[PDB]
């Protein structure tokens, strides 16, 4: 359970459910949290790089919104490297009582270094 040679954070909870301030978060068999029960926007984006400031405007455009409450939400890169999800900080962010985890920023960068053996994870349905 690594990406880029780094241990997936909290991957020891793969297949298990953890509690956070905002509710229970299930970790899948690969060690990635499933934030689909909490997402307010789940949008496919072509050309994600893992650069937050570059990627968020692309997600916002696909989500058809120009602003969001930054005190309440944070954008999550799904491990598919193709989807951004607008998640409550209470489940996503350690600072707000959420669960530490590894996400799609790592996978995108891993795949650039491993072009003949990419990690190809399935995508959630858009919302």
């Amino acid at each position: 359970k690594t990406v880029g040679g780094r241990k997936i954070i909290n991957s020891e909870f793969a297949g298990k459910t953890v509690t956070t301030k905002g509710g229970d978060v299930r970790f899948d068999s690969d060690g990635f949290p499933d934030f689909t029960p909490y997402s307010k926007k789940t949008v496919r984006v072509i050309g994600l790089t893992g650069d937050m400031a570059n990627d968020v405007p692309l997600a916002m455009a696909r989500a058809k919104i120009t602003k969001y409450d930054k005190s309440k939400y944070v954008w999550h890169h799904h491990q598919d490297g193709k989807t951004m999800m607008l998640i409550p900080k209470s489940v996503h962010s350690v600072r707000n009582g959420g669960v530490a985890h590894t996400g799609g920023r790592s996978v995108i960068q891993h795949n650039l270094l491993n072009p003949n053996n990419k990690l190809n994870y399935s995508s959630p349905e858009e919302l």
Partner: protein, 130 residues
């Protein structure tokens, strides 16, 4: 950990105008060679100054992840990355970037003042070069 010592390291971040100003500023990643090789972001957007009255609760959540690096988080950003300050003998007062995808990275020995001086307004049109 000595939270009083942590407060002494970061207390200037709670003073005005920088307390209100800094959350419209951004880190220019290309100024930091090692960081620029570690993460894809060209700029780190600063989103929150962690308040003094929450540091104990914040550290109770971050301690298991950061105590071995001896860095303490004090700024939130657009993603989950945090800007941290060193509190060990080797790194005391030095500013770090940390995230759960790529790890920790010292910002080339900059202390808090040097780090703050190099920030740009997020809306800056300043011409930046290779």
């Amino acid at each position: 950990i000595s939270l009083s010592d942590i407060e002494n390291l970061i207390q200037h971040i709670w003073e005005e105008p920088i307390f209100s100003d800094v959350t419209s500023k951004k880190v220019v990643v290309s100024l930091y060679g090692t960081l620029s090789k570690k993460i894809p972001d060209k700029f780190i957007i600063i989103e929150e100054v962690f308040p003094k009255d929450e540091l104990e609760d914040i550290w109770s959540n971050y301690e298991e992840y950061l105590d071995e690096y001896l860095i303490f988080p004090f700024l939130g950003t657009l993603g989950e990355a945090v800007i941290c300050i060193g509190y060990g003998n080797d790194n005391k007062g030095k500013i770090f970037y940390f995230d759960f995808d790529f790890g920790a990275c010292e910002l080339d020995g900059d202390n808090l003042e040097a780090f703050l001086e190099k920030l740009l307004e997020s809306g800056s049109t300043e011409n930046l070069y290779f």
